[PDB]
Scaffold this active site. Structure first.
Site, short mmCIF file in Angstrom:
data_model
loop_
_atom_site.label_atom_id
_atom_site.label_comp_id
_atom_site.label_asym_id
_atom_site.label_seq_id
_atom_site.Cartn_x
_atom_site.Cartn_y
_atom_site.Cartn_z
N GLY A 15 6.68 54.27 -37.01
CA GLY A 15 5.80 55.23 -37.64
C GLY A 15 5.33 54.86 -39.03
N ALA A 16 5.71 53.69 -39.54
CA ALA A 16 5.41 53.34 -40.93
C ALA A 16 3.95 52.96 -41.16
CB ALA A 16 6.31 52.20 -41.40
N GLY A 17 3.23 52.55 -40.11
CA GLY A 17 1.84 52.12 -40.28
C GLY A 17 1.57 50.68 -39.90
N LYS A 18 2.55 50.02 -39.28
CA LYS A 18 2.41 48.60 -38.95
C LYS A 18 1.18 48.34 -38.08
CE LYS A 18 6.39 48.43 -36.97
NZ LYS A 18 6.77 49.90 -37.14
N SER A 19 1.06 49.06 -36.96
CA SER A 19 -0.03 48.79 -36.04
C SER A 19 -1.37 49.18 -36.65
CB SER A 19 0.18 49.51 -34.69
OG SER A 19 1.42 49.16 -34.07
N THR A 20 -1.38 50.28 -37.41
CA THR A 20 -2.61 50.71 -38.05
C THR A 20 -3.11 49.65 -39.03
OG1 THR A 20 -1.93 53.03 -37.83
CG2 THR A 20 -3.66 52.51 -39.43
N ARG A 45 1.11 53.61 -24.45
CA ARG A 45 0.55 54.84 -24.99
C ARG A 45 -0.95 54.86 -24.76
NH1 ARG A 45 3.27 53.47 -30.83
NH2 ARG A 45 5.48 53.74 -30.24
N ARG A 138 1.96 62.07 -34.19
CA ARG A 138 1.58 61.15 -33.12
C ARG A 138 2.15 61.62 -31.78
NH1 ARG A 138 3.75 55.11 -33.95
NH2 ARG A 138 5.47 55.90 -32.66
N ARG A 149 14.48 56.81 -33.11
CA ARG A 149 13.61 56.11 -34.04
C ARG A 149 13.84 56.56 -35.47
NH1 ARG A 149 8.73 53.69 -31.87
NH2 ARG A 149 8.87 53.51 -29.59
N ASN A 172 3.44 52.70 -47.68
CA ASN A 172 2.22 53.20 -47.07
C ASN A 172 2.14 54.70 -47.35
OD1 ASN A 172 -0.06 53.78 -45.58
ND2 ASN A 172 0.97 53.61 -43.61
N1 LIG Z 1 -1.19 56.40 -44.91
C1 LIG Z 1 -1.06 57.21 -43.84
N2 LIG Z 1 -1.13 58.55 -43.97
C2 LIG Z 1 -1.01 59.37 -42.91
N3 LIG Z 1 -0.82 58.95 -41.65
C3 LIG Z 1 -0.73 57.62 -41.39
C4 LIG Z 1 -0.85 56.65 -42.48
N4 LIG Z 1 -0.72 55.41 -41.94
C5 LIG Z 1 -0.55 55.59 -40.60
N5 LIG Z 1 -0.56 56.91 -40.28
C6 LIG Z 1 -0.35 57.52 -38.95
O1 LIG Z 1 1.05 57.47 -38.69
C7 LIG Z 1 1.28 57.19 -37.32
C8 LIG Z 1 2.11 55.92 -37.23
O2 LIG Z 1 1.31 54.78 -37.57
P1 LIG Z 1 1.47 53.47 -36.63
O3 LIG Z 1 0.52 52.47 -37.23
O4 LIG Z 1 1.27 53.92 -35.19
O5 LIG Z 1 3.02 53.16 -36.92
P2 LIG Z 1 3.85 51.86 -36.43
O6 LIG Z 1 2.90 50.95 -35.71
O7 LIG Z 1 4.40 51.37 -37.74
O8 LIG Z 1 4.98 52.38 -35.57
C9 LIG Z 1 -0.08 57.05 -36.67
O9 LIG Z 1 -0.43 58.34 -36.17
C10 LIG Z 1 -1.00 56.75 -37.83
O10 LIG Z 1 -2.33 57.24 -37.60
N1 LIG Z 2 12.44 42.17 -32.35
C1 LIG Z 2 11.21 42.53 -31.92
N2 LIG Z 2 10.75 43.75 -32.22
C2 LIG Z 2 9.52 44.13 -31.80
C3 LIG Z 2 8.74 43.26 -31.06
N3 LIG Z 2 7.58 43.92 -30.77
C4 LIG Z 2 7.64 45.13 -31.34
N4 LIG Z 2 8.84 45.26 -31.94
C5 LIG Z 2 9.31 46.38 -32.76
O1 LIG Z 2 9.80 47.45 -31.98
C6 LIG Z 2 9.68 48.67 -32.76
C7 LIG Z 2 9.04 49.74 -31.89
O2 LIG Z 2 7.70 49.40 -31.55
P1 LIG Z 2 6.72 50.51 -30.98
O3 LIG Z 2 7.46 51.06 -29.77
O4 LIG Z 2 6.57 51.56 -32.15
O5 LIG Z 2 5.46 49.75 -30.60
C8 LIG Z 2 8.87 48.31 -34.01
O6 LIG Z 2 9.72 48.07 -35.13
C9 LIG Z 2 8.21 47.00 -33.62
O7 LIG Z 2 7.91 46.19 -34.73
C10 LIG Z 2 9.26 42.00 -30.76
O8 LIG Z 2 8.60 41.16 -30.11
N5 LIG Z 2 10.47 41.66 -31.21
F1 ALF Z 3 7.30 51.12 -34.58
AL1 ALF Z 3 5.88 51.76 -33.72
F2 ALF Z 3 4.31 52.28 -33.05
F3 ALF Z 3 6.47 53.46 -33.69
F4 ALF Z 3 5.14 50.14 -33.89
MG LIG Z 4 2.94 50.52 -33.71
#
Ligand SMILES: Nc1ncnc2c1ncn2[C@@H]1O[C@H](COP(=O)(O)OP(=O)(O)O)[C@@H](O)[C@H]1O
Ligand SMILES: Nc1nc2c(ncn2[C@@H]2O[C@H](COP(=O)(O)O)[C@@H](O)[C@H]2O)c(=O)[nH]1
Ligand code: ALF
Ligand SMILES: [Mg+2]
Length: 195
Positions: A15-20, A45, A138, A149, A172
């Site tokens: 939830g930290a914003g990695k994918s965004t 998803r 989300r 998580r 973030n």
């Molecule tokens: N700066 C921000 N402020 C508010 N919401 C955010 C921010 N950055 C990301 N989000 C939202 O938080 C949720 C988690 O971001 P996401 O990129 O999916 O997390 P991750 O990939 O780290 O698990 C998403 O709904 C995204 O739209």
């Molecule tokens: N160790 C490892 N973690 C991953 C890999 N792909 C995604 N993750 C991690 O798994 C966690 C959950 O991912 P999400 O389910 O939110 O996509 C996140 O911390 C993400 O970075 C991978 O290939 N290797």
């Molecule tokens: F860690 Al996630 F979407 F919740 F990349």
């Molecule tokens: Mg993600």
């Protein structure tokens, strides 16, 4: 395989914003970055695409590939398996692009043991309350998965203060600000890749 530019490992709690942030980076700088497409046994998803966000596989298929030696690393996270296949990284290195990996803290430590020599970046929320708010907004996970998580987030945020573990930690709060700081961390590599 040490091929091409220095790879980028992005980590941080769920939830930290990695994918965004990574999606934004790959949109703006599509010519110089390539995303490592991990395998996962979790369900997709809405909006996620096989072969783009992840290779979505069964436990049986992922176990077959693990047993064959196909993975650089793998980890169990919040009830599902994730991993970086050798070919996922080779595909990007073969294009002479900067390989970006999004992995958890276990994956960070796994990659520290390889020859990849990445820069390690952690993206963190301003607080666990805000993290939970963003996760529950989300709401792509069951309650049980959310609990797992949130517990991993608290543990891994403390562990990420380890000296020398992450080269840069980005909070973030505002996405535009986090994204600028992501590019700041990569600015010299971006300039070189443009040359
Ligand atoms: N700066 C921000 N402020 C508010 N919401 C955010 C921010 N950055 C990301 N989000 C939202 O938080 C949720 C988690 O971001 P996401 O990129 O999916 O997390 P991750 O990939 O780290 O698990 C998403 O709904 C995204 O739209
Ligand atoms: N160790 C490892 N973690 C991953 C890999 N792909 C995604 N993750 C991690 O798994 C966690 C959950 O991912 P999400 O389910 O939110 O996509 C996140 O911390 C993400 O970075 C991978 O290939 N290797
Ligand atoms: F860690 Al996630 F979407 F919740 F990349
Ligand atoms: Mg993600």
């Amino acid at each position: 395989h040490m091929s091409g530019p220095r790879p980028v490992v992005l980590s941080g709690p769920s939830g930290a914003g990695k994918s965004t942030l990574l999606k934004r980076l790959l949109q703006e700088h599509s010519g110089i970055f390539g995303f490592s497409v991990s395998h996962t046994t979790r369900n997709p998803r809405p909006g996620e695409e096989n072969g783009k966000d992840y290779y979505f596989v069964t436990r049986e298929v992922m176990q077959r590939d693990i047993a064959a030696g196909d993975f650089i690393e793998h980890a169990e996270f919040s009830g599902n398996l994730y991993g970086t296949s050798k070919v996922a990284v080779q595909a990007v290195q073969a294009m002479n692009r900067i390989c970006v990996l999004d992995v958890d803290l276990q994956g960070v430590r796994n990659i520290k043991a390889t020859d990849l020599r990445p820069i390690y970046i952690s993206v963190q929320p301003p607080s666990l309350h805000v993290l939970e708010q963003r996760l529950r907004q989300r709401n792509t996970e069951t309650e049980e998965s959310l609990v797992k998580r949130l517990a991993a987030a608290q543990a891994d945020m403390e562990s990420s203060k380890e000296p020398g573990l992450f080269d840069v930690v980005i909070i973030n709060d505002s996405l535009d600000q986090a994204y600028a700081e992501l590019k700041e961390a990569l600015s010299e590599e971006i300039k070189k890749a443009q040359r």
